[model samples]
Target: IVANCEFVNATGKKTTILVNENWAKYCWIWTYKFPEKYTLLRYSVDGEMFMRHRVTFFNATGRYITHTHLNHGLEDVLEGSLAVPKDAAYARIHAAINVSLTNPGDVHMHYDETEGEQIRSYDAAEFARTLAA
Candidate 1:
């Protein structure tokens, strides 16, 4: 089933989703706009390369922020959710999907994930800061 979340004041918030936890599986695919002149810092997991599921641009406030899809729906919009069966150990984060920004900017961005049971949410800015640091 698909789950949905609307952001009213998402500034400086982390929009993380839970992919794998305690033998359970969950995933997300969503779009977002980076704050003005802001960018994401480089992050890497050992021997893991994040996959760019899809790409699009968010045209808001006369500025263009690139939205990169990780894993979810059609390339043009955020729809549908993915289900990884239990025991699918490797079918998690890096093993599942990833995203890439047009470029790393300031670290502020509007973010959201899936509308499903498996998707979990978190503060995007806080997580980025931690990862960037």
Candidate 2:
């Protein structure tokens, strides 16, 4: 296993998140179930959105990867992937709790992992990258 995100509020709370900071890499899968108000981030664009809808994956190309949402509910697994570009790698999952408009009280998490190809729940993917070294 690579890592699991520490559970915590995406707001005001800090110091220690309650998961390991990432999911297991190498053809692994991570699942995070949360509020529908929050948004899931697609790689490149999320970086620019300023909003926190982000889960960056490290590919063999040495770049982060995430396909934009086209269908399915807020859950990430439905994003659809016919194949892993070249090789499967790692990822982070974050919930963009839109407290900006709605009230998402008690931002917590459910951490689950597997050996299949899938992945996000927190910036846990991003946080894992920092420790990839």
> Pick by lDDT: which candidate is best?
2
TM-scores, one per candidate: 0.24, 0.26
lDDT of 2 by residue, 1-133 (tens): 2222332223423222123334222122234333221222322111112233334444544455553222224433232222222232444443342221132222234344443232332244444442231
Model 1: lDDT of residue 83: 29
Cα deviation of 133 in candidate 2 (Å)? 12
Q: After superposition, how far is residue 77 of candidate 2 from its true place, in Å?
A: 11
C-alpha lDDT values of all predictions: 0.29, 0.31
- The top-ranked prediction according to TM-score is 2
